[PDB]
Design a protein around this ligand. Structure first.
Ligand SMILES: Nc1nc2c(ncn2[C@@H]2O[C@H](COP(=O)(O)OP(=O)(O)O)[C@@H](O)[C@H]2O)c(=O)[nH]1
Ligand SMILES: [Mg+2]
Length: 166
């Protein structure tokens, strides 16, 4: 069976844990210990192929847990997440991508830019701004809501399809 190693990165509070929990357990949590950093597994069929997702939900920043470094170096694809109502988290994306390019020593790394919390009103980051950023990196942009489930499967499965074109 094919395994796909995915890593979820982004500023604190954007919904990295919520997105992962939604994919894994199909439920939305209003509060998830921001310190909890762990890996989750899920068996799913994507385009007729049964595979196992090995997902690392990264926690704190400016820190390198023995596990994060491992997934960061062995990770096959990255979900770079920001929130639609958090301009700083969007501006922060540049830092996460520069970091990933450094670890892989490459500018061709499977990656998907995710704009989360699309269920919230009065967004401060327009879809167009994110689309422009994703285009500049040569990767897809997908909006999601860990609360309503909108785009969640699409974000993770598209990341798998990016790894496949690699
Ligand atoms: N309305 C809304 N709240 C969300 C969404 N995703 C996450 N949250 C909330 O945002 C806060 C931070 O989410 P969390 O998953 O802990 O963020 P992380 O720090 O990136 O892991 C929590 O209070 C969540 O309930 C979403 O899509 N919509
Ligand atoms: Mg978290």
């Amino acid at each position: 069976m094919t395994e796909y190693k995915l890593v979820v990165v982004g500023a604190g509070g954007v919904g990295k844990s919520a997105l992962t929990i939604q994919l894994i357990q199909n439920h939305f949590v209003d509060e998830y210990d921001p310190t909890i950093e762990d890996s989750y597994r899920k068996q799913v069929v994507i385009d007729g192929e049964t595979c196992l997702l090995d997902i690392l939900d990264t926690g704190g920043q400016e820190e390198y847990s023995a596990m994060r470094d491992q997934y960061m170096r062995t990770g096959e694809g990255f979900l770079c997440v920001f929130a639609i109502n958090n301009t700083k988290s969007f501006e922060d994306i540049h830092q996460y991508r520069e970091q990933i390019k450094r670890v892989k020593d490459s500018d061709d790394v499977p990656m998907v830019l995710v704009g989360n919390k699309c269920d919230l009103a009065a967004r401060t980051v327009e879809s167009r701004q994110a689309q422009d950023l994703a285009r500049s990196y040569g990767i897809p942009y997908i909006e999601t809501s860990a609360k309503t489930r909108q785009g969640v499967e699409d974000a993770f499965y598209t990341l798998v399809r990016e790894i496949r074109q690699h």
